[PDB]
Symmetry: C3
Subunit: 283 residues, 3 copies
């Protein structure tokens, strides 16, 4: 895989090529690339020009790294991400997270599109990620598998406090004081590898396990971020309701997923701006 | 693993070495190879003579591809299949499915032996597969992993309609007018990788997940078939009741599995006959 | 698919047999913080894993990385002082390599031990849970040490695991233990393997509870599958080293230092238990 020097080489490339010094990294998921629009003094790198960066092969993933200020805050944004289903091993999927750490980032915001498993969710809802279920992790697909480098973190990091409690309370609070539009949802995200969508029986499995939303990303990035000590916040856009009975003739499809992101673009933009305000400055 | 041209080469080899032109492909699982017996005008290929075909290493898997007519319908049958527990990557396990598509097949019938998890099933029951749970797929073992080729299908295919609803309706109706003793069962098949058989605690996990029958195949072939637009029908022969308590001195074993297929041969042969009568003809000949 | 040939296992076995006069009947694999179980071996002869042909290396704290032959309560034993885990980067054929070596040495009984997180709310830190059964989550998805061509010199293509943990040993150990006036009962339950190396989320803890697991760890199962495949009698137990976090209010977190400390606290109870255990292992039919 990647040596420590590989991560350092990439971080040094970025640090040499930009004056931006980000505090927060944001990973934009399927159809959420629009979150880069409000960056000021934006500087763009195509992933292809960044040493060791994988390529985004999925539609709705632009494949660019954008530095700028978001609500005055120094950010770096992955406009597009990587997925196991593309053929990438998790050490590639998660590579940018350790680079961000080496750039000086102290907070990772992870975003995604997700299928709703909890019947109370509607398409267009934002679900705050309170926790996850790492199904690939259980079987061996964990980005920390292999020799541990103490320069990044511990051999056996805990994940029970992965999603930052303070930011979650603040976000929930702020959306109470609105009382406008749908309320902010909260729940458990389960990662499945994909790329095919779930059967009805699989939908019922994931529900029985206690997941509220399902997708094919995010969890590995969180694990790596927590290993290197980043504060983590996550949310899903619920882009479709997972099919849960044999009567329906509806089927999950990627077109509908991207369409739901386009529709929620302004709402997501607002949410992320309020989010930045809840991140404390470094010491 | 395989290039688009690899699939092409194999399909052209077959198209150039037989005049048979199948509409239906049938994959015969453990102890089910006898389903080939009623083929008329049979032409046999050993897998070893077919470019790019993997080899069947499991007992009760003959490793032959047979072309012929089954109750008057033009079929190609896998007498034996491949399993990930043999060492094969899923792109090898499922290779033939994409070949079948290129041969002009529009329907895939997948068969297997399976261990009964639903206590209402008896050894010798046929269970129609209404749905599946893909446990390896959750963790990354899906035959679609990697770059997608649009010449086969979509990057993100849906699976919630994988097992053709109309065929299942017709098979159930037709079978319940034939007044046979044991009813035709219907349920959810769960794939596990194996090759070791389940513990009691594992059996209870699978039951809790909602599975009726468990085996170690089939699901990857269905995913690949649905990706390329094939109509899919599946059934399991329940060959053993999975062990469910710590008192029992009985154990799952492969010999009992094959024996159950032997005993069920006449019931299978008849089922497969009314199955063929439930497969739509193509719009144009 | 397995990276080792039959001859690789043979070579390692012959090397050991030609470098010690010890001829073990019982192999014992010592888990995290349980390496002290070797302290009571008499006539102990130690090999570093690094000097044994084909042996993997233990890279985890609390795993010494030594193979120790000797007598335990009068019985000929070989003990792995430290083991290997999938999370270290090893394929399962490497993790489980020693088990087939033990079979070639003449061992007929494998005792597997580990530290484990408690999922059953009745367990307390320091409890010994006898393993009645396991749930092999990596196995379901393809990570099984038997994957690939099968060598009938070791065992069957499709071995059963429903009787993996020897009932008779478990009945004898429980009975003997009960008659010795110990205040805290031996526990008994199902161990679930997850790959790690990160510890469980609360949601994951709840999944594992709902699946019927009593304790969770990151080892053991592969070794048992290989042991049963080649016909070894198997006994297993876990030291419950921590209660897995199961609510969002707690500020406590699983951590490896506390895991190792729990093994230190339990050294004496574990020593005494492994003695009752050795007395519960049948002798071979012939000497
Ligand atoms: N597993 C899964 N993932 C998603 C997603 C998340 N991603 C959306 C994209 C395919 O549209 C993949 O990267 C998965 C949205 N809806 C679903 C769903 O119903 N199921
Ligand atoms: N997992 C599992 N599979 C089967 C099967 C199906 N296959 C039968 C064959 C071994 O007998 C393997 O390819 C699995 C029958 N019974 C069982 C069972 O109890 N369990
Ligand atoms: N998964 C898991 N394993 C353990 C273990 C067992 N091992 C202890 C060591 C990390 O301390 C790893 O090899 C796993 C103890 N407690 C726990 C737990 O809470 N969870």
């Amino acid at each position: 895989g990647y040596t420590y020097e590989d991560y350092k080489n990439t971080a040094e490339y970025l640090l040499s090529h930009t004056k931006h010094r980000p505090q927060v990294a944001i990973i934009c998921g399927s159809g959420l690339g629009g979150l880069t629009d409000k960056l000021t003094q934006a500087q763009i790198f195509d992933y292809s020009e960044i040493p060791n960066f994988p390529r985004s092969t999925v539609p709705g993933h632009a494949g660019r790294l954008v530095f700028g200020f978001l609500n005055g805050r120094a950010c770096v944004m992955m406009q597009g991400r990587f997925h196991m289903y593309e053929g990438y091993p998790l050490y590639k999927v998660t590579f940018p997270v350790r680079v961000f750490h080496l750039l000086g980032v102290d907070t990772l915001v992870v975003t995604n599109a997700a299928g709703g498993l909890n019947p109370k969710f509607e398409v267009g809802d934002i679900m705050l990620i309170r926790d996850h279920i790492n199904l690939p992790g259980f079987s061996g697909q964990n980005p920390l598998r292999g020799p541990n480098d103490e320069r990044f973190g511990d051999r056996f990091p805990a994940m029970s406090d992965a999603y930052d409690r303070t930011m979650r309370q603040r976000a929930l609070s702020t959306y109470k004081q609105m009382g406008e539009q749908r309320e902010l949802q909260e729940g458990t995200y389960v990662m499945v590898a994909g790329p095919s969508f779930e059967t009805v029986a699989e939908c019922r499995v994931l529900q029985k396990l206690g997941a509220d939303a399902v997708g094919m990303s995010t969890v590995p990035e969180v694990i790596v971020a927590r290993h290197c000590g980043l504060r983590v916040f996550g949310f899903s856009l619920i882009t479709n309701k997972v099919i849960m009975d044999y009567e329906s003739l509806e089927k999950a499809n990627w077109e509908e997923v991207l369409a739901a992101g386009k529709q929620a673009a302004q709402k997501l933009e607002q949410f992320v701006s309020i989010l930045m305000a809840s991140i404390p400055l470094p010491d």
